[PDB]
Amino acid sequence: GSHSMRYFFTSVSRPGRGEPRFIAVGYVDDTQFVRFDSDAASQRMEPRAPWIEQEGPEYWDGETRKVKAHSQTHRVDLGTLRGCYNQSEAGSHTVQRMYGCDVGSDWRFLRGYHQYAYDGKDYIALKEDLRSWTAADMCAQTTKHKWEAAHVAEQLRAYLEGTCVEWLRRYLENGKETLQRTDAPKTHMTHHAVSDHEATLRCWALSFYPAEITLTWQRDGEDQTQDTELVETRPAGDGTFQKWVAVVVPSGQEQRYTCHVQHEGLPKPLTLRW
Amino acid sequence: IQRTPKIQVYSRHPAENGKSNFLNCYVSGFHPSDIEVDLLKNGERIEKVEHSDLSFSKDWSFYLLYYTEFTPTEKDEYACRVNHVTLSQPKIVKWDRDM
Ligand code: MET
């Protein structure tokens, strides 16, 4: 199936004293593999998956250099944006940056992206062609002009289309035992009665990877969305994911309803019935 | 500009009395990132709680997993207590094994 490598960066200003809180994380697919936290004692990019531990000190030195450079760029940008929006020194503000690459099942480049937010709202993003910018407002437009004149897009595109994909291939190889493994959902159904006329059927999917999943209910073989509740997919904490979907039914009619589970780890979708 | 957290409290494994399980509180969809999350045993804060590295979703909202070991029993009540700038009062979500 398809894979992705993504880096996420958050900076939160600290008005009264010192530099922003800066947190960076990298992921392959739905697996975190590196982190940096400005508040942590190492001041190094740190491993978070066993397969990256392979990398030698030259890797760790390079990533540490790049991540600290990002933190400084955020620091500077927080100042610039404060000034552009005419904000005071009193308030904490946030910048967020995300970038990375998708590849298909052949591990060839599909798509790249590079996007930036201020105070949790879109600011500027590279368009899908990796050649132009989308700027949300006039501050961001000024930023667009500055990045156009400095040919930023060109540099990023070369990373996103090339370097990014090459790293992702490396890690998929080195981490193959988990990263190339699919863990099919382990499913069951539970039954709860509210009253003697209403029952809840809950269809559980546990211990699956990757996170993408579809849970759907049918009544007499027809899709039913009313009287259903789907919780957000959630991490188990062991690397796998959980989800459930529930339907309310008339007590005694439980046999009409079926739960349908789609996942990359299942060669055919599964059907569960009470 | 502020987005209130969504909260799920749950175990990593089917909840079995007597066996070392893991209690999770998953907070998501929130902005800004500053948040206070505690796991409670019979209303009292659990001290050894860890959390994931701060990340965020496509809509820029933040998510964190807070977690602690525990060997469940059938007397002990568990909950997750969250405070955030969007909340006038701390929100408590009780752990219910069936969710
Ligand atoms: C950890 S910051 C560097 C991220 C990524 N490896 C890059 O070269 O852009």
mmCIF file of N, CA and C and ligand atoms in Angstrom, chain A residues 5 7 9 22 24-26 33-36 45 59 62-70 99 156 159 163-164 167 171, ligand 1:
data_model
loop_
_atom_site.group_PDB
_atom_site.id
_atom_site.type_symbol
_atom_site.label_atom_id
_atom_site.label_comp_id
_atom_site.label_asym_id
_atom_site.label_seq_id
_atom_site.Cartn_x
_atom_site.Cartn_y
_atom_site.Cartn_z
ATOM 1 N N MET A 5 6.110 9.945 4.709
ATOM 2 C CA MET A 5 7.014 10.481 5.792
ATOM 3 C C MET A 5 6.606 11.942 6.039
ATOM 4 N N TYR A 7 6.963 15.399 8.853
ATOM 5 C CA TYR A 7 7.505 16.084 10.009
ATOM 6 C C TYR A 7 6.560 17.185 10.483
ATOM 7 N N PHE A 9 6.104 20.404 13.389
ATOM 8 C CA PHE A 9 6.884 21.335 14.203
ATOM 9 C C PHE A 9 5.943 22.353 14.846
ATOM 10 N N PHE A 22 9.597 24.576 21.746
ATOM 11 C CA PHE A 22 9.678 24.027 20.349
ATOM 12 C C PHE A 22 9.660 22.514 20.451
ATOM 13 N N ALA A 24 9.309 19.056 17.885
ATOM 14 C CA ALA A 24 9.271 18.473 16.536
ATOM 15 C C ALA A 24 9.147 16.954 16.641
ATOM 16 N N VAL A 25 8.357 16.395 15.725
ATOM 17 C CA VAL A 25 8.151 14.926 15.646
ATOM 18 C C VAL A 25 8.204 14.516 14.187
ATOM 19 N N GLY A 26 8.780 13.346 13.925
ATOM 20 C CA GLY A 26 8.709 12.762 12.628
ATOM 21 C C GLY A 26 8.001 11.430 12.665
ATOM 22 N N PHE A 33 8.947 8.205 14.761
ATOM 23 C CA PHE A 33 10.311 7.638 14.788
ATOM 24 C C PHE A 33 11.354 8.591 15.388
ATOM 25 N N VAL A 34 11.133 9.909 15.402
ATOM 26 C CA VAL A 34 12.083 10.844 16.012
ATOM 27 C C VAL A 34 11.308 11.935 16.756
ATOM 28 N N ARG A 35 11.982 12.603 17.705
ATOM 29 C CA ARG A 35 11.435 13.777 18.358
ATOM 30 C C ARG A 35 12.562 14.737 18.736
ATOM 31 N N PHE A 36 12.207 16.016 18.889
ATOM 32 C CA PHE A 36 13.013 16.984 19.584
ATOM 33 C C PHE A 36 12.109 17.803 20.450
ATOM 34 N N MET A 45 18.138 15.613 18.429
ATOM 35 C CA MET A 45 17.099 14.779 17.834
ATOM 36 C C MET A 45 17.237 13.400 18.435
ATOM 37 N N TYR A 59 24.208 10.905 11.279
ATOM 38 C CA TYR A 59 22.762 11.132 11.048
ATOM 39 C C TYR A 59 22.237 12.045 12.155
ATOM 40 N N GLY A 62 23.298 15.606 11.916
ATOM 41 C CA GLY A 62 22.650 16.290 10.834
ATOM 42 C C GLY A 62 21.212 16.667 11.205
ATOM 43 N N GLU A 63 20.452 15.688 11.718
ATOM 44 C CA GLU A 63 19.096 15.983 12.105
ATOM 45 C C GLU A 63 19.017 16.987 13.259
ATOM 46 N N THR A 64 19.974 16.940 14.200
ATOM 47 C CA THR A 64 19.987 17.861 15.298
ATOM 48 C C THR A 64 20.255 19.278 14.769
ATOM 49 N N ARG A 65 21.206 19.414 13.836
ATOM 50 C CA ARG A 65 21.501 20.692 13.225
ATOM 51 C C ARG A 65 20.250 21.239 12.519
ATOM 52 N N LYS A 66 19.611 20.411 11.681
ATOM 53 C CA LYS A 66 18.414 20.855 10.893
ATOM 54 C C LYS A 66 17.256 21.262 11.827
ATOM 55 N N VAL A 67 17.020 20.490 12.884
ATOM 56 C CA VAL A 67 15.871 20.745 13.774
ATOM 57 C C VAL A 67 16.083 22.036 14.585
ATOM 58 N N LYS A 68 17.322 22.270 15.007
ATOM 59 C CA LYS A 68 17.631 23.507 15.730
ATOM 60 C C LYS A 68 17.526 24.704 14.788
ATOM 61 N N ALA A 69 17.891 24.536 13.524
ATOM 62 C CA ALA A 69 17.699 25.580 12.523
ATOM 63 C C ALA A 69 16.217 25.889 12.373
ATOM 64 N N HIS A 70 15.358 24.849 12.301
ATOM 65 C CA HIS A 70 13.939 25.099 12.243
ATOM 66 C C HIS A 70 13.418 25.900 13.449
ATOM 67 N N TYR A 99 5.524 19.167 6.858
ATOM 68 C CA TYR A 99 5.843 18.866 5.500
ATOM 69 C C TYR A 99 6.172 17.396 5.363
ATOM 70 N N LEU A 156 12.480 23.336 -1.779
ATOM 71 C CA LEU A 156 11.585 22.421 -1.119
ATOM 72 C C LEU A 156 11.160 21.311 -2.083
ATOM 73 N N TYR A 159 13.626 18.628 -2.397
ATOM 74 C CA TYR A 159 13.586 17.742 -1.199
ATOM 75 C C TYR A 159 12.376 16.799 -1.294
ATOM 76 N N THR A 163 14.861 13.656 -2.132
ATOM 77 C CA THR A 163 15.407 13.378 -0.845
ATOM 78 C C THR A 163 14.389 12.737 0.121
ATOM 79 N N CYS A 164 13.230 13.372 0.253
ATOM 80 C CA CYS A 164 12.159 12.867 1.143
ATOM 81 C C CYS A 164 11.835 11.381 0.805
ATOM 82 N N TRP A 167 14.691 8.897 1.730
ATOM 83 C CA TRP A 167 14.667 8.600 3.108
ATOM 84 C C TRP A 167 13.543 7.609 3.430
ATOM 85 N N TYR A 171 13.862 3.972 5.284
ATOM 86 C CA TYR A 171 13.277 3.589 6.514
ATOM 87 C C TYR A 171 12.311 2.416 6.380
HETATM 88 C C1 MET C 1 14.373 16.857 12.036
HETATM 89 S S1 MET C 1 14.429 18.393 11.119
HETATM 90 C C2 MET C 1 14.912 17.739 9.472
HETATM 91 C C3 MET C 1 13.770 17.012 8.859
HETATM 92 C C4 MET C 1 14.073 16.328 7.512
HETATM 93 N N1 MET C 1 14.864 15.098 7.746
HETATM 94 C C5 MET C 1 14.745 17.267 6.492
HETATM 95 O O1 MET C 1 15.920 17.051 6.010
HETATM 96 O O2 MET C 1 14.093 18.338 6.157
#
